[PDB]
Design a protein around this ligand. Sequence first.
Ligand code: NDP
Ligand code: NDP
Ligand code: KBK
Ligand code: KBK
Ligand code: MG
Ligand code: MG
Lengths: 410, 410
Amino acid sequence: PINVAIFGSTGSIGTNALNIIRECNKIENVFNVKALYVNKSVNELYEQAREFLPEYLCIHDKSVYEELKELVKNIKDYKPIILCGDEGMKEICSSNSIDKIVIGIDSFQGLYSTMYAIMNNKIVALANKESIVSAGFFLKKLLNIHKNAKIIPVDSEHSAIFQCLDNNKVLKTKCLQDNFSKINNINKIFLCSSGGPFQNLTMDELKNVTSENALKHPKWKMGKKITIDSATMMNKGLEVIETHFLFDVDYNDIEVIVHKECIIHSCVEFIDKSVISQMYYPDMQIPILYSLTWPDRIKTNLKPLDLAQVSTLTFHKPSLEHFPCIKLAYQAGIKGNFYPTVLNASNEIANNLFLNNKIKYFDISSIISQVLESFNSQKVSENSEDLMKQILQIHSWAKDKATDIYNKHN
Amino acid sequence: PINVAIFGSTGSIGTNALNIIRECNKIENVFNVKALYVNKSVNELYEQAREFLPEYLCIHDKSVYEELKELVKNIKDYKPIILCGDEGMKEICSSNSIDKIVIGIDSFQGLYSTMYAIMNNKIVALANKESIVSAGFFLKKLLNIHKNAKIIPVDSEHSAIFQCLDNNKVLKTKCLQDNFSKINNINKIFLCSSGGPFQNLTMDELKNVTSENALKHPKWKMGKKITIDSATMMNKGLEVIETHFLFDVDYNDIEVIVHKECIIHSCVEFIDKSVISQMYYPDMQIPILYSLTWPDRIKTNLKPLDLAQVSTLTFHKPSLEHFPCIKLAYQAGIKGNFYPTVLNASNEIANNLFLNNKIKYFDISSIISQVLESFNSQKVSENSEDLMKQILQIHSWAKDKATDIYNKHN
Ligand SMILES: NC(=O)C1=CN([C@@H]2O[C@H](COP(=O)(O)OP(=O)(O)OC[C@H]3O[C@@H](n4cnc5c(N)ncnc54)[C@H](OP(=O)(O)O)[C@@H]3O)[C@@H](O)[C@H]2O)C=CC1
Ligand SMILES: NC(=O)C1=CN([C@@H]2O[C@H](COP(=O)(O)OP(=O)(O)OC[C@H]3O[C@@H](n4cnc5c(N)ncnc54)[C@H](OP(=O)(O)O)[C@@H]3O)[C@@H](O)[C@H]2O)C=CC1
Ligand SMILES: COc1ccc([C@H](OCC(=O)N(C)O)P(=O)(O)O)cc1
Ligand SMILES: COc1ccc([C@H](OCC(=O)N(C)O)P(=O)(O)O)cc1
Ligand SMILES: [Mg+2]
Ligand SMILES: [Mg+2]
């Protein structure tokens, strides 16, 4: 019986996490939701609290901690440990009652809970990709110290890849570890992309796209930031780096392929040239579930895949001219050092600027290129505590520099 | 270092088997070809003998045993054990020097060597599907006695399925064993089909197709019998039953899907509804290699898959009206008992009759239906020796009855 915490429960991933847990529990109860944790949204956390009755509840924002303790008074015969800020986060990671922790907090901020989840030797079902991009070697170093901790990828493409693996080999190693690809006989990765809503546009049309065109008609509603990254393909850019770290695959062995129906979620070519891929409808229910039940699988009543209903599956290379964020991500990843940190930090700004209609589409890649060009490699700190500080200083600097380039231009 | 015998070496599978062995050995020598075995074709066996220098050589046909011993005299410093008939076959299966045996003999006749390979506790890389159709429960019974013997499927779709499996689970069991699908969390199988050359024909055009239209433009040259079965889709019919036996999957959980580009070789849906599939270009080099290196994989220099070059992959249900052999195969398999034996035996005849332009296309299914309709279930023999005899008597009877229906109609 699997004890699970959901970090970022009110968001897209968190909501989807509880949905599949709920649905699986109907068939046979095997999950216990032990904790939930959010930033600002008090009401919805309360609603989730009544449904799942988690032993722990927590909220980052101090100033709604009163406004919440209050609301949880209405549940009868229910006394939860109710906590606040990073301190609550740390306490939940400490609990000897929680086995597995889902990381559905967005952006750079997801790194802190991921960091502590590892420190506490937990299974970490990680959807937050920014943490891996900004801090992969830090996470590697940290996973090396804490032998029993594990990152199980929830990002759908990375879930797919992980599912294509013979667990006979995976079990001899773990994600984000040198030699993962050699132990798993991995030769190369096809990293599938939906292509986003802007895929068939001319350069001219592209120049003019807006924040609004990007958010429109979600297959399922994702957080605003990933949705924008999907649209610039910076999301695939980030996922390239994430692949390199998770599975120790060289950048030259990672191929981005646009596959608009999103049925094949990614493919692994093995050293004999046999390719294995994972398929399902565009959905996060399966990656989340698998990360919670690995190395096993359990029954669900999800809609079965129907290949004849899908009928056609297509594959084409992305245009680097239309989607330059991809190139930038490869450049940054191949240079290594802290360039991924800079890539990620400057995108966060340019993503928000475009989101709030502050900048045009090609200004996104323009900002990110200028910031990367302005960065200079630093000696990688030796101990974990110093490395973290260094990551933080570089992250804030790249953010400031991005804001700065925008300011110095209107 | 892997010691391999190739049964049916001069045929399509046997030739392809040695090709991949040769090519893999160039990269790093890991295979030793220990034996080769054929029916009638003396010259080519000799040629293979000079290339591979196998410790044993054998030929079924007694009357070319002289004509061969003669030819092998020309190789210098090379003294092979040269054998004949079933007796040679048995001796090779006995050898303590041979680990793994590839079964590339066609038709019902492949059952004998498969039978003895199992009896001798060998790894059996089995491409011959007819043996599984005619004798699955006999093979199951036999694999139960001989714990260390294993059928590793070489049939590409079955190879694909086997490759989609977590070897962590496979290793707890083996192919052709009750509960295989439960231990592997298998819910259902998409069994892919090329569809054959007749796929877009109208009923009228279909009625008129010839033996010649069927053999035309092989992607790679296959034996005449499988090629014809491919064309009627009786080949997929047989593979449905083969799937049921190999992986203990219910017939209602096996779906035939026409996928003309033949890149996805088959898919496995697991109990959580996640689907895994294996992909490559239409080729037998990979299934053969995998069956020889399982549970491991090794390097090859095969042409890598290029999804953007493939571009489109399509899936549609087959027409039972155009391809009634498929229905007949499901009917026979679901009835069980010895109906698969009858299905297989009567097809062999109707396949040959069509091949030699003796009958029309729909006469194939007509003959096979009449034979099945005429059969009556028998109590399944209790001991292995009696079961075998019973399989043999039913096989010959269905053949005679098929010939007979044809005779009584011109
Ligand atoms: N959405 C998706 O299908 C996918 C998402 N991902 C990744 O997963 C992560 C989650 O993204 P997504 O769910 O889309 O984003 P959302 O905006 O939908 O959700 C963010 C969640 O994190 C919470 N959060 C923000 N800050 C904190 C904090 N400091 N402490 C605790 N919780 C916090 C939010 O809380 P609050 O509600 O209180 O504001 C909310 O619950 C991202 O990194 C994304 O890249 C990866 C693949 C697919
Ligand atoms: N061809 C393919 O790509 C595929 C084949 N298969 C299966 O594999 C099996 C082999 O088919 P395929 O290679 O096409 O057929 P072929 O006709 O090309 O080859 C048959 C081989 O078996 C040999 N043979 C026949 N009788 C005997 C015997 N009594 N003793 C020893 N050898 C014998 C033949 O010898 P000889 O040359 O002397 O006549 C020849 O070497 C079939 O059951 C088929 O269904 C499955 C999937 C794909
Ligand atoms: C319509 O369905 C999809 C839309 C977008 C995406 C991808 O973004 C979200 C993501 O990383 N997932 C699901 O792992 P993509 O980066 O391929 O556009 C994947 C599927
Ligand atoms: C053009 O490539 C192909 C032609 C035919 C087939 C199949 O027949 C041969 C076979 O069983 N294999 C390869 O496992 P199918 O039964 O799908 O027509 C598979 C691929
Ligand atoms: Mg993703
Ligand atoms: Mg086949």
